[PDB]
Ligand binder design. Structure first.
Ligand SMILES: CO[C@@H]1O[C@H](CO)[C@H](O)[C@@H](O[C@]2(C(=O)O)C[C@H](O)[C@@H](NC(=O)CO)[C@@H]([C@@H](O)[C@@H](O)CO)O2)[C@H]1O
Ligand code: NA
Ligand code: NA
Length: 204
């Protein structure tokens, strides 16, 4: 038997670092090598793209480094560039191959039913998708159809205060009717409708 791998659903986001760990076990208790690779290229290939996907495995080549009770772990990490293309097909299916002391290597099987095992999908999303802006602030304005500059600034400050985890260099803008736009570093956006963040007292 070859080393067995447990990975996951590895979603990553433009403009952001990522880090995941896969777990690897072997019936011998030992794994000597781990490669993460594209499917193409035959048994000797180590080619992996995109080039910003990195990985590392500590504690290779030691007895008992890959047991059920303490699996070997491989870090899969990197920084997603702002210039990545994002769409419904902007994923990359990759394979984790580990070798035991007898040279048995994890088999690459091209089937989505192996995803989360030795096969995994790296999905690149736009930066906005990492964030779920809180809509729990409320700013009272004079007239919801015509916010002043000071009122627009107050709405933006309230949204920022409720959203400390949004990237500090994301830009929060508010329109004359209170609509909020959060523009992330990769230039994707989230919107918040005005009536979730702004009210007036015009209605008796
Ligand atoms: C032998 O054929 C390969 O089998 C694999 C499984 O073994 C994969 O199924 C398969 O397709 C995908 C994939 O999921 O990786 C579909 C993605 O939509 C697509 N990504 C983009 O286009 C990004 O914009 C594409 C590739 O361009 C990347 O992987 C580049 O290396 O590959 C196929 O080519
Ligand atoms: Na084995
Ligand atoms: Na979002």
């Amino acid at each position: 038997e070859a080393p067995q791998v447990k990975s996951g659903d590895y979603v990553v986001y433009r403009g952001e670092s990522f880090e995941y760990y896969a777990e690897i076990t072997d019936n011998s208790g030992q794994v000597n090598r781990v490669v993460i690779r594209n499917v193409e290229g035959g048994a000797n290939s180590t080619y992996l793209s995109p080039n910003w996907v990195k990985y590392s495995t500590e504690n290779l080549g030691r007895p008992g480094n890959a047991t059920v009770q303490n699996p070997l772990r491989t870090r899969i990490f990197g920084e997603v560039p702002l210039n990545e293309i994002v769409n419904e097909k902007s994923y990359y299916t990759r394979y984790i191959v580990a070798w035991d002391p007898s040279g048995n290597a994890t088999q690459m099987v091209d089937n989505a039913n192996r995803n989360g095992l030795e096969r995994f999908v790296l999905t690149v999303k736009s930066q906005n998708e990492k964030y779920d802006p809180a809509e729990s602030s409320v700013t009272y304005v004079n007239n919801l159809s015509n916010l002043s500059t000071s009122e627009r600034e107050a709405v933006a400050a309230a949204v920022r205060a409720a959203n400390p985890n949004i990237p500090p260099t994301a830009k929060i803008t508010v329109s004359q009717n209170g609509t909020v736009t959060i523009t992330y570093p990769d230039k994707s956006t989230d919107t918040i409708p005005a009536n979730r963040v702004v009210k007036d007292l015009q209605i008796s």
